[PDB]
């Protein structure tokens, strides 16, 4: 049996700037049980039709997870630009996989403001496909040296989403699992 049940129900989920990935092999996939669940609100499949998934079997599969806002769910797709798909996580233009996204206004809806999930704001160049950078050195905005001191023209290169219990539908948190098939 596959470990799918573990990634879809784990008690902890990483933020988007340090997204974890898992590799799964030697299991019997059961896309069926997830082919009818109504919990998922955005079950998009790119490259391969979702119905024929069960018949064919592959060698190696990868699963990645993020917690993202309501608006940026559409940005997890090939050939898209924005504040998230270009500096934090980008997909190859020849993507062949699935992007499951569901609502998490119960587990992750902190009371009084969470301020624990952060996304990357400032950088210097775009991101190659499947590129992760956990480093958090101080970013500079001018020729003046910054020597690791926060201040004018010296900004921390992260921002904290503000998830709350009464936010609108467009800003409520969503959890995304992207499956990539080699």
């Amino acid at each position: 049996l596959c470990p799918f049940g573990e990634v879809f129900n784990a008690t902890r989920f990483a933020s988007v700037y340090a997204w974890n990935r898992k590799r799964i092999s030697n299991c019997v996939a059961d896309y069926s049980v997830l082919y009818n669940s109504a919990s998922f609100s955005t079950f998009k499949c790119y490259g391969v039709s979702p119905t024929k998934l069960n018949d064919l079997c592959f060698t190696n599969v990868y699963a990645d997870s993020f917690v993202i806002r309501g608006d940026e769910v559409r940005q997890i797709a090939p050939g898209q630009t924005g504040k998230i798909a270009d500096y934090n996580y980008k997909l190859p233009d020849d993507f062949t996989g699935c992007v499951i996204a569901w609502n998490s206004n119960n587990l992750d809806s902190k009371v009084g403001g969470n301020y624990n999930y952060l996304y990357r704001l400032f950088r210097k160049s775009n991101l190659k496909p499947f590129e992760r950078d956990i480093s958090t050195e101080i970013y500079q905005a001018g020729s003046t040296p910054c020597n690791g001191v926060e201040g004018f023209n010296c900004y921390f290169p992260l921002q904290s989403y503000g998830f709350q219990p009464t936010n609108g539908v467009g800003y409520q948190p969503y959890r995304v699992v992207v499956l990539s098939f080699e």
Partner: antibody, heavy 110, light 106 residues
Framework: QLVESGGGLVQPGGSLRLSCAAS????????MNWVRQAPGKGLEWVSV???????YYAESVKGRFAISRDNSKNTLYLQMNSLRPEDTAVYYC????????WGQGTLVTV | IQMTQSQSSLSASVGDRVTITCQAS??????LNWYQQKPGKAPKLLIY???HLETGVPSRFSGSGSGTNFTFTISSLQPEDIATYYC?????????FGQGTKLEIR
């Protein structure tokens, strides 16, 4: 600080290259905004360029102007192509998303 | 998203408290900026994210509101504060400005 230049009159259908010169600020590392204003009317958005090179234009003026950056002189350039009579307005060059500083301003008329 | 200012001109005396309302269609959670523009000058940012105050402006200026309606409050009016104020949506492109409100002293 910033500075604009190239303001004046141009015959309908022409083109121009407005220059925004920046000092103390590296143009290759911040979000940049280009905002226009009609004479006596309210502000309207025109263009934005991201640090990574992505660029967004306004919905009503899409496909006629082009913004670019030059690191050798540290400048921002905007090239308008295929103008019209109502295109006349005062444009500006500003920094966004941390510590907004708005430059003095140029005038472009038909 | 169509930001709107129902009012267009409010007058008061020196030392009075003045409020300005800016409404937004659909919903913007906490994304709005208050811009001030003096006659014949370049506009300067006053309040970002509708609750945090910028450095340099006196503390007597304040902002509040959320969801659909936002408000800008001046506690003590000053003789040299005649200007035009705008509210701008600044979450994700495009960024649509408002109509503007002109303050008059008497």
């Amino acid at each position: 600080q910033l500075v604009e230049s190239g303001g004046g009159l141009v015959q309908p259908g022409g083109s121009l290259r407005l220059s925004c010169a920046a000092s103390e600020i590296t143009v290759s590392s911040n979000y940049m905004n280009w905002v226009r204003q009609a004479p006596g009317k309210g502000l309207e958005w025109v263009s934005v360029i991201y640090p990574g090179g992505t660029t967004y234009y306004a919905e009503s003026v899409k496909g006629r102007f082009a913004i670019s950056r030059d690191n050798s002189k540290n400048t921002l350039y905007l090239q308008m192509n295929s103008l019209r009579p109502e295109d006349t307005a005062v444009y500006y060059c500003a920094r966004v998303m941390r510590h907004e500083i708005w430059g003095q301003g140029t005038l472009v008329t038909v | 998203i169509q930001m709107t200012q129902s009012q267009s001109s409010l007058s008061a005396s020196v030392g009075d408290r003045v409020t300005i309302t800016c409404q937004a269609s659909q919903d913007i959670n906490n994304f709005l900026n208050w811009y001030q523009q003096k006659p014949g000058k370049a506009p300067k940012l006053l309040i970002y994210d509708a609750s945090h105050l910028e450095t340099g402006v006196p503390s007597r200026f304040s902002g509040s509101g959320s969801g659909t309606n936002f408000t800008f409050t001046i506690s003590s009016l000053q003789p040299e504060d005649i200007a035009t104020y705008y509210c701008q949506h600044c979450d994700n492109p495009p960024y649509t400005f408002g109509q503007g409100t002109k303050l008059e002293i008497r």
